[PDB]
Symmetry: C4
Subunit: 95 residues, 4 copies
């Protein structure tokens, strides 16, 4: 399960890297803002402080969302159940 976590973890980083590079290049964001934006998009928060301005950015965002949501939310699920939950349970007992 550490290896089920590791795979989704890696694939999430790669996905966020892809968005950082595209939005920094095509939409002209600073790298930190492109990552932030990629995260705010794929978790569906969508503040809108940043949003794509070019048609190439709009089209990319459509595809990035559909390809990216299932991965991101899979990782969050694995994180919650296989990492966060056990550590919570361990805290309720003194060794």
């Amino acid at each position: 399960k550490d290896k089920e976590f590791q795979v989704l973890f890696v694939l999430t980083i790669l996905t966020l890297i892809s968005g950082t590079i595209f939005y920094s290049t095509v939409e002209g964001l600073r790298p930190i803002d492109a990552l932030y934006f990629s995260v705010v998009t794929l978790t569906t928060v969508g503040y809108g402080d940043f949003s794509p301005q070019t048609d190439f950015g709009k089209i990319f965002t459509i595809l990035y969302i559909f390809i990216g949501i299932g991965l991101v939310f899979g990782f969050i699920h694995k994180l919650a159940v296989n990492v966060q939950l056990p550590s919570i349970l361990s805290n309720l007992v003194p060794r």
Copy 2:
């Protein structure tokens, strides 16, 4: 399962087409912006760079969301599990 994917795929395209046509017509968006907006609405991202301005657009958006979320997120589920997951698994093995 390719035919379970195909049905949801088609129904998603039809749903996004419906929104593209309405928002381009009633809210005056360019077709590309209406599609983008329809996608950003039904995936619940909701940047708000675009939002309906007319009461007819507001009422439509209410119904489009309720009718459209269950479909869109069904497709994303099918996509993740029946397409993305297997291809990931295939990459971890050399033929």
Copy 3:
């Protein structure tokens, strides 16, 4: 199952009514905008074209979200599986 649908349906309408009344009264929105806003909040779209300006509105929105999301998304689930899915299946066959 029509009666499992009917209950969630009614409870959803009541929930959206509650929000329409509060936001129209305390935040000064037109009734149509308060409903629209209530729907955009509880489905987690959150365009932000409307957002509460008063501390009383902010506090209410916190509680409305936590109480309201589980209901709204339950209805959408019931809608998709017990209404939308069967009708889709019926269309694929001529009577």
Copy 4:
């Protein structure tokens, strides 16, 4: 199950407290606005009336979202099924 509810309830309050303190301190929000913002972020509504302006706030928000969504939505699930549902069922019968 009251103790399964109580744990997630407490962990949710602690999580929202953490965000209130950070955003009030680093991003300069009033405490009430920082709580409101933390809630609007972790439920994925994301109005964007508030959004982090500093790089330290942006980085924190990335991590807060990934750590916080699984908890928040777990609580909402427990709330809906173990608290809201039973009380609904009890109302349909006179004692």
